[PDB]
Amino acid sequence: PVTINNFNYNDPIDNNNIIMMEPPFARGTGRYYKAFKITDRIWIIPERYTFGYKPEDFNKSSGIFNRDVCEYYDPDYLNTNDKKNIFLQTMIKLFNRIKSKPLGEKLLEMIINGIPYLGDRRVPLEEFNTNIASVTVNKLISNPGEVERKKGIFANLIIFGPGPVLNENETIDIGIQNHFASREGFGGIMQMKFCPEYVSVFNNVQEASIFNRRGYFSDPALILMHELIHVLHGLYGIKVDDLPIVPNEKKFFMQSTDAIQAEELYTFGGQDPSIITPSTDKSIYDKVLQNFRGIVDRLNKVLVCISDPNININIYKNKFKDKYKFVEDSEGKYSIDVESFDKLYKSLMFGFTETNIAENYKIKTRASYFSDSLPPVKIKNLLDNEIYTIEEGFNISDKDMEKEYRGQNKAINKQAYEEISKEHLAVYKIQMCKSGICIDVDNEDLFFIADKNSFSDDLSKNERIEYNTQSNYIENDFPINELILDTDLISKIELPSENTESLTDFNVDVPVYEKQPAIKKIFTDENTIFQYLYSQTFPLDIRDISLTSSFDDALLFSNKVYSFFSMDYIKTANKVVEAGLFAGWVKQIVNDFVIEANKSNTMDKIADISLIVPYIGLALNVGNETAKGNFENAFEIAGASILLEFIPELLIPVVGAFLLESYIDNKNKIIKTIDNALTKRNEKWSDMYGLIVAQWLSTVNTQFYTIKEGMYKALNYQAQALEEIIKYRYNIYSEKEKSNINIDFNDINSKLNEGINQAIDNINNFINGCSVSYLMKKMIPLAVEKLLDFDNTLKKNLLNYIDENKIGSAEYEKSKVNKYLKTIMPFDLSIYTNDTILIEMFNKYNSEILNNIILNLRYKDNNLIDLSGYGAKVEVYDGVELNDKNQFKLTSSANSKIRVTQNQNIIFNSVFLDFSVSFWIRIPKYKNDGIQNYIHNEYTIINCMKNNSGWKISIRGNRIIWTLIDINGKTKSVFFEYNIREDISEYINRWFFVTITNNLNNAKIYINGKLESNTDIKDIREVIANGEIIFKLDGDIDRTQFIWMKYFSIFNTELSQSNIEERYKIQSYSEYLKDFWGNPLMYNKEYYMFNAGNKNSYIKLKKDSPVGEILTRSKYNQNSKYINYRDLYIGEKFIIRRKSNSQSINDDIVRKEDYIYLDFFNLNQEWRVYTYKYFKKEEEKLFLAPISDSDEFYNTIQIKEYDEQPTYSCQLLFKKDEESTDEIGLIGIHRFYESGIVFEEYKDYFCISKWYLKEVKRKPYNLKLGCNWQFIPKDEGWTE
């Protein structure tokens, strides 16, 4: 296997495993460096990397080299032999840790055996050349001086110490004459600057961090394996260059940084390889395959070596052959074997990745290449087995530090590292100035957004299709379990000897590095995320602060700090009290904090949004000036797009035309030139999707990431300000007082910190949801548009080609070109990534029924708009009446209609027909004098057709019908018909909930949650349902006909009885009571009274007494056999009067638990409903009389709602007053016995009783109770 050699810096040079090397970039001059062979082909040179850096660049200065690194400097690292030795023994411990597992061992075995080819592009094909700076390095044998005797050796890797920045490790490849052999299939001597003690830190949980350090530090063994992978790539010459991801740097808020090549993202692995589109994934693949082709060609022509005649040609042809896995026939002719080439390429690109390795060694690491990095820490002593071991790293089981990566946790394993002198770090910043007053922001914190230039246009080219053309897919994945099982991977071919002729051609390009201003001053007067966060901090030389809800004073005054929490919270926080009241005050301001932070779990179900964090806007004011107005509302309208700081310009090209041309003649076999044109279409879809996912991850999800982060900081700064205030108020008191104040600062932070954690969890689900939403509604659809377009153009491309050829199949193989293109590829994120976090975001998004809404009509600023997020066009004509209660009216006028142009690029169409339509509706009563036309005339109210196919909602009298029409013209229906011979109906002219669902076998109609009708729709063919939707009364309707609708919406999936019952309860909910028809109950409005327990009964002021008698309602008197009902406009006319408010009398809405006066009219006076305060019985006739203030009667009533289920009924409770919990009883109707000298009978009266009090508490709620009322005002939908 792999042998890790041992030695000490002070060991003597022997010119074998301890030498005096003359590094490549030395150009063969300057001086020599003592090097050690830690394993075959691998050397360690324990000295600073100085090639290309000015000796001064090692000190901390006004500059920085890299823009995204908190750079630590220290020129004294490795300035002694004892340090050089420690560096050595540390490197040794690391390689041992690397080989401690099969996986890292295979890495090393691959790096040792992957010897650089002999020569590069310049070397003739038939030759070998060891005399080039990328193949040979020189060792010195002289003693008193240089030059005297120089020997040459081969090497695969030289690891130096760090350059100017300790924590900026980097693998470097050799360039000669503007070219890189490590990028052309040859490979070449690799170099590296590595530092083991100064590791990077990445953000993550560590306690709950509202006081104790947060984050985890890296295992230097993974940091070295990350670098070795670059080495591997270099050695095999596949570290090719291609179209990089480049940051957009046009806006002041965008992160400036170097371009990022695929090789770096492939090395990290995880989700990062998804940012490299499938088009580029293939570009690279092809360039590497092309390189190997050249190498396999050389092996077939190589004969002599004109550099070291000592070189054995056969020995080398057998090594390279095994390196590259070429196949050698029985004659010796070398050739590329696609399968082996494949597994090898994937192994080097997707097998050995920092993600797969960390998982294997059980080491924690950063989630993505694009993730905020914290400042570095110094590991105290990697040479101490109590702190770090070969087998386990920092996560040692004996110290119970294996679980949860505790060994790398900063808040837990503080004996393992040291914080570093910030007075030694350098950070590239952007000083954001106005116009006086500027703010420094670390480039790290800005938004990273991939410019459009970052993505390939290869999708717009053409494709010659032939019987040969096959599919091309590079799965950015490789099963690491088999890679750990030796068969192919590791080479058992002898490794040639490292000694050879000396290097004499020291030609080579040596990179020069220079620093650049660390601070970059830019100008802008905007106050977005960065400013709002700054507004929440304060200087260290200030201990006395006060909160303000005003962003501007906060910026102006140093002792003023901005808070996005409530006005109430802010007032209490700035409170100042007596020591005797400090405890209490602390207890509540912290609880307040907790309650405010938890407002991040706010629901908004009525607007079809399950999760919403109302304060995100005030907190960051990110995107579309979100700190102004009501955040919840604005989100409800534009959605996740208002949170984005920048709306990116996507790259969605026209998929290049096809050509099946190049293939004629009457060959009935090459026919597959079409069969391959189809599967190639599927490749074009997939690739387009991958193109999208790639832009989403680097232009959209990156921005959301910055928001989740900004919220973490925002919430933290908040707790910090609060703790600062608390501490100040406490220390104002004398020691005598403090001693008696019961305060536990550890419980304060604990509680403050717990709240933040609960919030972050909410803020996270919220933001991920948006990100996915923006993916699915503002990105995927646009991609579908072009694919459905390419489809068409491709449909005419084909067919016509089945025409230009011959032949029976020509017909049965033309249908094949139909049934295929009639199937669009469903987007599935799991196809382009395997990152668990992402997959979970996506699965969570597809499991929320609400995300299935493709149309949701809502009133907003006197117009109806689609809020689904798919941007349906909504044209609302003049004949339509709208109110802010979301009710719209459709009349008989030709201009009373709504036209909706559905989004044509959404999924909805597929074999089965799966979607739902939900809405509320009020259908006016029939005119008694036209019952004939009513029951005979059927009229459409919502029509959605295309090519004579689609769905339709119509009404014929008392019946509502759902109708389906497939392309062939076949029709099926289903309907709900409400009886019109009921004394009192629950549907006629009353608002009710309709829901229609369709699966592959049934069309079901639900009314108010319950299922009323079913219908088999198997026979039904395809039903085109994405045509224009026309809302309008169309048919032979009466001039007086009208309809009221509300909350109209569509789901592209069948809703379940559960989802329906829930939608019903959600939309039914209101803070107010309702009247008989289902509309808001109102003050100062005439109403007749209905009793839910005595349907056919009404109240009337008895002639000779202050009581309301109860009479039988009169009914429909005409001679119709089709109708029958009870009059509703009968009995006394009541009018609910507000109890409080002494400032005039308008006409507001009646809310639950409201105090009212139940009055009514008698002739030209307004009387009232009273109760005798002293009845000793359980029930008593109510006392009805003129308005007055008598101390013997209760006049104040409380309107309540005991039912927990949807109902238009309500109850009237009599209480002592507005506080006592003393209930007098409920208003209802009672039956009494009467015996006088002439009449003996029973009669019911307007009663009040205690008996109802306990009855209303039972479950399920008794809707039949006599204490249940409903108010009926006149209504055009009901004439009698």
Ligand SMILES: CC(=O)N[C@H]1[C@H]([C@H](O)[C@H](O)CO)O[C@@](O[C@H]2[C@@H](O)[C@@H](CO)O[C@H](O[C@H]3[C@H](O)[C@@H](O)[C@@H](O)O[C@@H]3CO)[C@@H]2O)(C(=O)O)C[C@@H]1O
């Ligand atoms: C409408 C009706 O007749 N049904 C209920 C009536 C009615 O709701 C109220 O009278 C008017 O709102 O009430 C019933 O009795 C309860 C109560 O209302 C009165 C009855 O006058 O007292 C009842 O308790 C006692 C009752 O007075 C005595 O005659 C004797 O029977 O003992 C009972 C219990 O100790 C009771 O609280 C009614 O039956 O009259 C209940 C009806 O469902």
Ligand SMILES: [Zn+2]
């Ligand atoms: Zn890297």
